[PDB]
Design a protein around this ligand. Structure first.
Ligand SMILES: Nc1ncnc2c1ncn2[C@@H]1O[C@H](CO)[C@@H](O)[C@H]1O
Ligand SMILES: [K+]
Ligand SMILES: [K+]
Ligand SMILES: [K+]
Ligand SMILES: [Mg+2]
Length: 346
């Protein structure tokens, strides 16, 4: 019963991607009921950050996609530490009362920056989109003597009930990617989309990402994410989910608004790095474990044209409770870092 995270291995450019919700100290302390299982000393930022930095240093990924990156801590400690490791860092803070956000970092030696494309999901003119969540999309040029790579990162709305907002937020991210990744030959460049989607494998939202299609007629708003909730007394998704003045089509691309079928679509071909279930046993993988939750909500998606060489295996709920849950004295987030090795064949 050994508890280990192994590397599963499945004219080129090779690069590794890490997706990691590092847990904002402010979000930690605002929700202390989630960490009742934890010994008090392991929760302090002074304890947690060195461990998190050690992980990042150890894995030495070419691209970092981080969530719950607290602004004050980012400026003071996280960004300087990452810059020292040879990373160029781009940040997008949430737009509300919560001063955390997403960062996409990449090694100077591996890429040049073509464009930075932040996405704010908050729209003051649209009542539906009243949440502070954000995304970030970079276009990177691999440094070799080659096509660009589009890297996206997000942290979608947590609230389990509001699947209408989740899907609209996702649509806004997909729309940005569609714009940035478009090439002169009319196809999309290779895409890596990381983040905390607050949605479980096999959920409608997850299915939408994988299939590029969703029939959402008669679907309760709470069922979208597959997060734990009653589902009683929930309203059904509207057709359309979001209003025309968002300027995004049902194919999740920007469109020219004109002065004035319940199926969502996107034009990408996306695979998930992780299978979500252990092959031998069929036990589900988890990416987050605390007092109230043990689920997968973190993903690395990629265009399948990249080839996945390897991934760092996840753990079961039972495995994580053997080490008394997350965070603990050895692992300093309530999430596990996702890690993938990719190959771009030229
Ligand atoms: N919030 C929790 N959820 C699930 N299991 C827990 C929780 N807190 C402690 N445990 C574990 O459950 C068992 C309780 O005896 C122990 O193995 C302990 O680590
Ligand atoms: K929040
Ligand atoms: K409702
Ligand atoms: K235990
Ligand atoms: Mg969290």
């Amino acid at each position: 019963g050994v508890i280990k995270r192994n590397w599963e291995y499945i004219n080129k450019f090779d690069f590794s991607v890490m997706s990691y919700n590092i847990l904002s100290q402010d979000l930690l302390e605002d929700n202390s009921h989630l960490y009742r299982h934890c010994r008090r000393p392991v929760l302090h930022w002074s304890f947690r950050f060195p461990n998190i930095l050690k992980e990042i240093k150890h894995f030495d990924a070419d691209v970092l996609c981080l969530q719950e990156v607290q602004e004050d801590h980012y400026g003071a400690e996280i960004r300087p530490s990452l810059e020292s490791l040879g990373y160029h860092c781009e940040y997008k803070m949430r737009t509300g009362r919560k001063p955390d956000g997403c960062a996409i970092c990449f090694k100077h030696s591996k890429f040049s920056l073509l464009s930075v494309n932040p996405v704010e999901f908050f729209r003051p003119d649209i009542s539906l989109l009243d949440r502070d969540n954000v995304g970030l999309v970079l276009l990177l040029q691999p440094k070799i003597p080659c096509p660009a790579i589009c890297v996206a990162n997000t942290h979608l709305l947590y609230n389990p009930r509001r699947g209408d907002i989740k899907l609209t937020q996702l649509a806004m991210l997909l729309a940005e990617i569609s714009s940035v990744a478009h090439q002169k030959d009319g196809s999309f460049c290779p895409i890596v989309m990381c983040g905390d989607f607050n949605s479980v494998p096999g959920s409608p939202l997850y299915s939408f990402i994988k299939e590029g299609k969703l029939n959402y007629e008669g679907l309760p708003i709470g069922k979208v994410s597959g997060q734990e909730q009653s589902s009683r007394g929930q309203r059904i998704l509207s057709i359309p989910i979001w209003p025309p003045n968002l300027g995004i089509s049902q194919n999740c691309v920007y469109e020219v608004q004109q002065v004035p079928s319940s199926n969502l679509q996107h034009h990408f071909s996306l695979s998930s790095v992780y299978s979500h279930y252990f092959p031998d046993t069929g036990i589900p993988e988890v990416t987050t474990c605390h007092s109230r939750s043990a689920i997968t909500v973190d993903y690395i998606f990629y265009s399948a044209g990249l080839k996945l060489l390897a991934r760092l295996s996840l753990l079961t709920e039972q495995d994580l409770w053997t080490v008394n849950g997350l965070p603990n004295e050895n692992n300093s987030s309530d999430h596990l870092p996702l890690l993938a090795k990719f190959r771009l064949e030229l």
